[model samples]
Target: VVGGTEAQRNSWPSQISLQYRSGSSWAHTCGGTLIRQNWVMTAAHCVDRELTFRVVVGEHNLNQNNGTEQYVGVQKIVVHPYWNTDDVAAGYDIALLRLAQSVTLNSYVQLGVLPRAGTILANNSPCYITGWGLTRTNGQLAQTLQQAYLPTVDYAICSSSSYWGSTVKNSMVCAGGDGVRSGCQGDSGGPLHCLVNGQYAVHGVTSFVSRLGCNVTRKPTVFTRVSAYISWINNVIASN
Candidate 1:
């Protein structure tokens, strides 16, 4: 339900998808969103190959017929300086990609606003997350866009023994397991958005967890809080 008419969906900023080839095989693969027509946010691990990568914007269907799909080569890839695949810092697995050519801004694609720091999300708050990710944990990615409702989780509860257990950092936000919906595989780097002032604000960038399935009670989907890197993001956008 998060996507519909092009006009209605155009207001969301983090709708672009990253497509790239994998190591040695040149086999094409993909990941999720970031800012519209601009940067592509993905996992640092997704860059572990020697293949080239590109960004596609304003797309609703993976078939690439219903809407325009502009492919722009990666100008640069900026992995988080502190990114580590193993450790409490492992959740900081985010990366940003600068496109070789700037995308033509369109009505259906827009830039997202970042949430302010220290903004506490209540467990009852409703938010949206969409991607061409898997519908089931063991299934392949769906060819059509899929969305889910994510309920914010209490930081205190998220940090409890069953969750990250105090290992969760202030730079992250937890959401999932409310039973209605959840973010699954292939949604990595997608934005977790909250509606504020009638526009979608990116509160978090999809990151990680111990399981592949989503919304299993007591397990939380961890996302990188975007506000902490606002200055760096601003500079990247400006310099590019």
Candidate 2:
């Protein structure tokens, strides 16, 4: 994430590193949230490519073995039916990965608490976007996880012509339009943790940054609103 710092080792235990096979090695491609022992929430765009992928739970640093990590294979991938590769702005960029085996939960690894369906944060509500994405636009990916304070930018403001305009749909959440700190490449599919009633909940799946750059004034980072997909997620998990 741009203009962020290394996160506390245990600050976001539910955070995950989504990696895909590259040559003979696995490379971190995106971030994800462990929604269940065997299911992960990420962006469909992260897996739009055809490649072998695995998830690393309890990961803090991608370049080193933290020992707390649990490498698990993805048994199945379920991308939202309405998600179109050519049009992420159209919404429905969410996806779920069913793990081959259920990983054990502990202090360093746990399930993310999702927000209630249809829940929307007030304007400028406190939130943080965490990931191992680039520290800057067109920069190399960070070796360690990072966290940036990204307050919510309500729809009324985000959708304005001065901001993201009509491309910022209600189905998405916009945050951190300050142009300094924001989600960048390699951060897609990460979690946007928001504080609500004294508890942190996974409210967003990192969707997209401005085409102009990772961080731009009036172009906040956009996310797939998790609360808007509760029923769809439940149905996918139950039926699969």
Candidate 3:
């Protein structure tokens, strides 16, 4: 569970709440877009194992259980073909889920576009990321879907010697300030939503290393650029 309070989490119009049970211990992972009746774009790692997962559509209050939380068993899980979880490649850190059943689309549920490669999000891009990840490094998963405005950082600056030069790949985007505020510990496998065509698009999947904090100066949060894998996602969905 990673997010802000009920009030803060409900602020974002687009958010996918999630719940999972690994044995008796419950693990929560949220953040996604409603692409279609049977598919929701999310982090592959979210359902990599046999744990039962549920996608709570259009939810705000984690404490209150009134929202329509749909539990669609994962018919199949597709991690990026190139993804090597062991090595944690920046390129293939994205994934998709084919639900056992389709979900009904409402006003809050919709799809988004992929940002063009080398696309420059305007300075201080007003992007949002919601997740049930931790508020702090050692904090528990938040019940409410936390929201934040992450700006796209210059890749050159991100790849500078002091920053993420060695690991930041062309298939990723960088955002967030330093440790002060950012997609810190619990914001993994979540979507990095950017504005395009007056709608929010899943431009990136939260990738690696935000340990130093949001504005660690050198440590910019990384994401798997979704535009780079649209074909693969389509192919998988089509075959299913």
Candidate 4:
């Protein structure tokens, strides 16, 4: 995350670190949300490579051996049927991974709440993007979890020519295009937590940043709107 601060442990218990086995080490590749004890929500693009993957719950620092962490193998991966590997800009970038085992619930780990179907945040509504992704566009991923305030940018303004033009779709949410704060590389598949009705919900799946850079003025970080895929998510979870 660009312009983010280290997050307090257990503050975002539903956040997870998605990693892949790389030769002798497991490398952190993306972020994900613990939607269920055995189900994780992430970006489809995160798993495009045929690498072995695992999820670490209750994780804060990627390189630290926090006792609270629960590592689980990804038993099954289900990507949206309409998702296209070549067209992330067209949306449908969401995916779900079924875990090998159900993780225990505690102060360090919990399930992420999803928004009701068809819900949309008001323009500039308060929200936060949390992840162990890059701290800057060309920087390395953070050691500890980080978060930044990235309020909602309504679809109308986000799709404006000066903003993201037609690249921002209704199925996507825009946030933090201020050029100083935004989602950077390695943040994909993380959650954009937004408070609604006094409770925070997983409203987005981190999707893309501008081609120019991770954080750019009028080029907010775009996310796959979770509300738009409520039915699809339910269906996949039910059958798989």
Give every collision pair in model 1: none
On residues 10-43, what C-alpha lDDT tens digit does candidate 4 reach at each position?
Answer: 7999999999999979999999999989999999
Give TM per candidate. 0.84, 0.99, 0.84, 0.99
Full-model lDDT for every candidate: 0.67, 0.94, 0.65, 0.93
The residue-by-residue lDDT of candidate 3 on 1-240, one tens digit each, is: 222333353344445655687677545665666566777777655555666777656665566674655556667677777776566654687677777887666654545455654465665676776676777656666666776667777667777777687678767778765445566555667778888778777787776665444446557678777777777788888987
Candidate 1 stretches greater than 4 Å from native: 1-13, 22-36
lDDT (Cα, tens digit) per residue for candidate 2, span 1-240: 999999988999999999999999999999999988999999999999999999999999888888889999999999999999999999999999999999999999999999999999999999999999999899999998999999999999999899988887999999998989999999999999999999999999999988799999889999999999999999999987
Q: What's the lDDT for residue 131 in model 2?
A: 95
**For residue 184, what is the lDDT in candidate 1?**
64
- Considering summed lDDT, which 10 consecutive residues are worst modelled in model 2? 60-69
RMSD of 1: 3.6
lDDT of 2: 0.94
TM-score of 2: 0.99
> Pairing residues by index, what is the TM-score of model 3?
0.84
Question: Could you tally the backbone clashes for each prediction?
Answer: 0, 0, 19, 0
Clashing pairs in 4: none
